[PDB]
Amino acid sequence: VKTEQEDVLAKELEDVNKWGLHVFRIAELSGNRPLTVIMHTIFQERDLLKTFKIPVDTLITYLMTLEDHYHADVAYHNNIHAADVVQSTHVLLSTPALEAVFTDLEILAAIFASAIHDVDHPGVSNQFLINTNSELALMYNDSSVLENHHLAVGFKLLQEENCDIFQNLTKKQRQSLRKMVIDIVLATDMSKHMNLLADLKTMVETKKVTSSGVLLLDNYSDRIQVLQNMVHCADLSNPTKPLQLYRQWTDRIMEEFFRQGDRERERGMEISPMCDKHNASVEKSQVGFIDYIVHPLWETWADLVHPDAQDILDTLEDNREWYQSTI
Ligand SMILES: CCNC(=O)N1CCc2c(sc(NC(=O)Cc3cccs3)c2C(=O)OC2CCCC2)C1
Ligand SMILES: [Zn+2]
Ligand SMILES: [Zn+2]
């Protein structure tokens, strides 16, 4: 029998299958363990432990280890953000239009990639790491610096004591899982955005459907690019969440950006675009960002899974008009 706090946490976790879970409340209730508890809930919810023979304590140990490698003093790019994207991907996976499409392995990869996609994020951008001549930048030859590091770290952690949650997968399963996870995480790099969206639009144009309205994806290219856009959507899903959640996310990312702005000035690096704490229209940046990136993307997704994303798209448009007022 759980403590009262655990019971309250548990009643919150009953919303796991719903857009708008109050992830910040879960983070509070769980003693800053939103990623661990949300992942554990999803894995049990999707029967992943049985299917892949994952020992539960190995799962817990890894999860806790993973979460510990997110930075608590990073305003946005932290374990709470990881948890959010995990659960969001989780919801997108359950969309009616994609029912019975993806194998258990592919689901496992989409969720695991979500969990690790930002681990050990230092709270500054690729360009900042490149311009400071940082070790990380030189390791990854300035290309997808953070994203390569997230992957390397997330896999490496499997080697810590009692952390290998994939210890029972066959070599075939592990090689396939790993490639999918790598393709998914590298695609979270925003510099890949336009091309990702190009492929997504192209697939909407050529969209096919079989037996009860469910999408058809008959080659790795198509299947992986869908999962890639799905996680990228989860990663840019803040403006589609209830305004209460969206506003908290905006505060956090702007706090992070201004911190980077401060660090840039403390050294006379050119103050990044809209990273200047003194001259910034948060409201205006959010609208432009929605019009130019978030809405085109979500609208395209909505077409792929029509009409499943209708409410998410409505919410995004509502939050867009709201921020517009604010100006
Ligand atoms: C142009 C391609 N990408 C980029 O420019 N950059 C800089 C601007 C930006 C990103 S990623 C992101 N937002 C998120 O990933 C999730 C959220 C969306 C909405 C609230 S949290 C923003 C962003 O929300 O930044 C603000 C809007 C403009 C400046 C501040 C990369
Ligand atoms: Zn990222
Ligand atoms: Zn992210």
Side-chain angles (χ1 to χ4, degrees):
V1 240
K2 28 216 181 56
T3 64
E4 293 313 280
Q5 189 170 359
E6 294 163 353
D7 177 50
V8 173
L9 197 217
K11 306 194 194 305
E12 290 290 349
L13 287 163
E14 278 172 24
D15 280 353
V16 250
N17 297 343
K18 298 172 171 189
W19 214 247
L21 170 80
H22 197 109
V23 64
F24 293 103
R25 183 84 203 288
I26 286 171
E28 276 167 22
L29 288 182
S30 59
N32 203 14
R33 281 282 178 262
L35 183 63
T36 298
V37 303
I38 286 163
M39 281 284 279
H40 179 75
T41 304
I42 284 150
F43 273 56
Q44 297 275 16
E45 174 73 356
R46 279 177 180 281
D47 211 27
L48 296 173
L49 298 103
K50 284 185 170 171
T51 302
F52 292 106
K53 292 318 173 291
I54 311 172
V56 299
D57 56 303
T58 315
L59 182 65
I60 293 176
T61 303
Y62 176 83
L63 290 175
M64 269 169 185
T65 305
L66 182 63
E67 187 152 30
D68 286 338
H69 281 79
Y70 281 92
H71 299 198
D73 66 343
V74 165
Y76 181 90
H77 279 118
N78 55 55
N79 59 310
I80 307 179
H81 170 65
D84 187 15
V85 172
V86 164
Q87 188 263 335
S88 292
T89 296
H90 170 61
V91 178
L92 295 170
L93 279 167
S94 308
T95 198
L98 295 170
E99 277 182 1
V101 171
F102 297 107
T103 68
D104 283 319
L105 195 62
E106 283 163 344
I107 293 175
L108 176 53
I111 288 162
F112 177 82
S114 290
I116 69 153
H117 87 281
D118 270 331
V119 60
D120 200 44
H121 202 303
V124 286
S125 64
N126 281 328
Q127 198 54 67
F128 183 92
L129 293 170
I130 290 167
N131 295 354
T132 41
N133 205 243
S134 74
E135 173 174 19
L136 227 35
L138 309 182
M139 243 287 163
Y140 297 109
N141 304 299
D142 298 356
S143 43
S144 293
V145 175
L146 286 152
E147 296 75 19
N148 277 299
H149 180 57
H150 304 319
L151 277 160
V153 163
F155 286 108
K156 201 76 247 285
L157 289 174
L158 295 161
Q159 301 182 9
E160 291 205 350
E161 186 65 38
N162 197 209
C163 287
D164 188 1
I165 59 171
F166 309 128
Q167 68 193 58
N168 292 329
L169 279 56
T170 66
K171 185 62 185 184
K172 259 186 209 308
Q173 288 175 311
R174 300 183 269 114
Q175 289 206 114
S176 165
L177 174 61
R178 169 171 166 82
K179 189 187 181 64
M180 292 192 285
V181 165
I182 294 177
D183 296 333
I184 295 173
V185 174
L186 289 172
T188 63
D189 181 350
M190 277 289 309
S191 98
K192 307 308 190 187
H193 168 78
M194 289 302 173
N195 322 258
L196 259 189
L197 180 60
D199 298 348
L200 191 63
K201 263 128 81 209
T202 278
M203 172 161 290
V204 163
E205 297 169 15
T206 323
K207 167 185 184 169
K208 293 202 173 182
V209 167
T210 329
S211 190
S212 186
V214 153
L215 204 80
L216 187 151
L217 314 167
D218 70 43
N219 58 288
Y220 183 69
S221 261
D222 287 351
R223 298 176 75 90
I224 200 54
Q225 69 89 186
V226 168
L227 296 169
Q228 291 176 314
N229 272 285
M230 182 187 298
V231 170
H232 180 49
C233 285
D235 208 32
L236 297 175
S237 75
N238 323 71
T240 73
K241 303 295 185 49
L243 182 59
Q244 168 86 33
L245 291 173
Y246 184 13
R247 286 247 269 143
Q248 300 182 62
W249 287 121
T250 303
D251 300 334
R252 280 157 178 288
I253 208 162
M254 295 314 296
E255 180 176 344
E256 186 165 312
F257 288 169
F258 298 151
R259 295 244 177 256
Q260 170 175 322
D262 296 345
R263 281 156 74 163
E264 280 176 330
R265 197 160 39 253
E266 282 180 325
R267 322 170 184 204
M269 301 171 71
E270 263 221 319
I271 325 291
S272 295
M274 312 177 206
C275 277
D276 196 320
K277 177 187 43 184
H278 300 305
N279 259 320
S281 41
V282 165
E283 299 85 24
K284 225 178 296 175
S285 290
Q286 282 302 322
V287 180
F289 189 70
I290 291 177
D291 294 332
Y292 291 110
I293 298 175
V294 194
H295 198 281
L297 173 59
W298 274 101
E299 183 178 79
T300 305
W301 182 264
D303 293 326
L304 188 66
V305 301
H306 198 274
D308 297 346
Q310 196 40 75
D311 298 342
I312 295 170
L313 195 55
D314 292 340
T315 305
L316 173 65
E317 291 162 10
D318 292 333
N319 291 329
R320 196 283 195 171
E321 296 306 287
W322 184 87
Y323 262 101
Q324 257 289 313
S325 321
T326 319
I327 315 173

